[PDB]
Amino acid sequence: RGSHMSAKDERARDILRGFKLNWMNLRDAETGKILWQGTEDLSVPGVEHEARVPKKILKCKAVSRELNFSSAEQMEKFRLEQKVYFKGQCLEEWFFEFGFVIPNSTNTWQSLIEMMPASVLTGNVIIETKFFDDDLLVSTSKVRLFYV
């Protein structure tokens, strides 16, 4: 009976406690047309988040994403790994690295993200996001997408 807590376990939890995704948007990477804006803290694990995006986003060759996030804790190499799941099948693997995060900072992060109809995809796509500081997994979050 009992458990172990490491310094890395403490740090992971402390980063997550101090971390908040404040807002996020998606634009058509070519035209710059704003497709979706959201304010849900998608860093929160355990729960299933939801996002309702317009059907027209599927016609985009590439999407520009902008994230605004706050962090109480310092991070050396803040990064995201993302998986696009369709009915549990991983369609795409993405990798984004921000780098150093100043303690008690608010930061902005822009990323470029490059067949099935909206009627099939809607409610069946899950984006899983893993938040790291280098080796350290801080959070795993899930967002179910609806194409509306």
Numbering used by the authors: -3 to 110, 117 to 150
Provide the authors' original text about this structure.
Prenyl-binding protein (PrBP/δ) is a 17 kDa ubiquitous solubilization factor. In its 3D structure, it is highly similar to other solubilization factors such as RhoGDI or UNC119 (uncoordination mutant 119 of C. elegans) despite a very low sequence identity of 10% and 24%, respectively.
The crystal structure for the N-terminally His-tagged apo-PrBP/δ monomer was solved at a resolution of 1.81 Å (for data collection, structure determination and refinement statistics). The cargo-free structure of apo-PrBP/δ monomer obtained here shows the typical immunoglobulin-like fold: a β-sandwich comprising two anti-parallel β-sheets packing against each other. Intriguingly, the interior of the β-sandwich harbors a deep hydrophobic cavity, which provides optimal environment for a prenyl-moiety. The main difference lies in the depth of the cavities which is in the open apo-PrBP/δ approximately 18 Å whereas in closed conformation only ~6 Å, excluding binding of any isoprenes in the closed state.
